[PDB]
Amino acid sequence: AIRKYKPTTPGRRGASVSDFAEITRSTPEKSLVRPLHGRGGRNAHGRITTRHKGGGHKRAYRMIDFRRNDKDGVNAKVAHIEYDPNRTARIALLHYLDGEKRYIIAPNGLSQGDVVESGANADIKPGNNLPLRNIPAGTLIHAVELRPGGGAKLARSAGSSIQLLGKEASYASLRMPSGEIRRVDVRCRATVGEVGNAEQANINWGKAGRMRWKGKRPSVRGVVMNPVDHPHGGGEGKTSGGRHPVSPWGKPEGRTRNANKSSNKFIVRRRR
């Protein structure tokens, strides 16, 4: 579902786009929309804390239900599959039988009109949300919460999933999408399946301005700066940087995780 353009212009030579074949109803649901504004990388002090940000198209926030705690047994119906500019997945509008509208991340294979269950008595179908205690092992899940009642945090980009390895007593072993083996509580909730829109990694954005539309502002290498600007700056022709490679703030490469962070008791294995 990746349409390739034809090379009519130099900016559309290798370019490609989504086919958008999964989407019904091009407009969002008006009560579930909150406004956003840009920042350009600036914090509350007004200074750039994240470089290469700004420009970008105007956006509105779609309220996603990352909790799904309060409808255990009330079934829902997938009404539409909509575009969300705020993320790489598509979103599914749910019509619960009691009368409430919600958005969730659309799993792989949750076409329009499907019924979605929730709670400890749900079926293992793509889109149902259960506690991890009720999911069997080996099941591909997504949108998993770290603490109980805290909201979905893990594996929720497009195409990503967690494999549930095993449950021993009070803890489930998860394989996160990086190869990380993490141990979390079994009262944590997770949605069955795999996040859809899995072909968007193959999109070739064709031109510089197409990434300026998405909010990515240009990026100057440190080796073509001056030594007052970067530790790699300097030289009379072009260099490699006359030192082992560092950040713009002089920090070397290497492990930046806190070596005695509190969650080391929960990590079985680091990523590969």
Residue 221 backbone phi and psi in degrees, to 5: -65, 150
217 binds RNA (CB under 7 A): yes
Give the one entry of RNA, Mg ion, none that residue 8 binds, where binding means its C-beta sits below a cut-off of 5 to 8 angstroms depending on kind.
RNA
Residue whose CB is less far from Mg ion, 134 or 200: 200
Site string for RNA, 52-91 (x = CB under 7 A): xxxxxxxxxx-xx--------xxx-x-----x-xxxxx--
Residue whose CB is less far from RNA, 51 or 134: 51
Element spanning 17, H or E: strand 16-18
Beta carbon of residue 167, minimum distance to Mg ion (angstroms, whole number): 23
Which of 118, 128, 129, 160: binder of RNA (CB under 7 A)?
160
Amino acid at site 13: R
Which of 11, 222, 235, 241: binder of Mg ion (CB under 5 A)?
235
Residue whose CB is less far from Mg ion, 150 or 248: 248
- Coil vs helix vs strand at 5: coil
Which residues in the 105-124 window bind RNA by CB under 7 A?
Answer: none
99 binds Mg ion (CB under 5 A): no
230 binds RNA (CB under 7 A): yes
Is residue 213 left, alpha or beta, with left meaning phi > 0 and alpha meaning psi from -120 to 50?
Answer: alpha
Distance between CA 255 and CA 22 in Å, rounded? 40
- The size of the chain, in residues, is 272
Which residues in the 232-271 window bind RNA by CB under 7 A?
Answer: 232, 237-241, 244-258, 260-263, 265-267, 271
* 133 Cβ neighbours under 8 A, 6+ residues apart: 120, 167, 186, 187
CB-count burial class (<10 Å; 0-12, 13-18, 19+) for 262: exposed
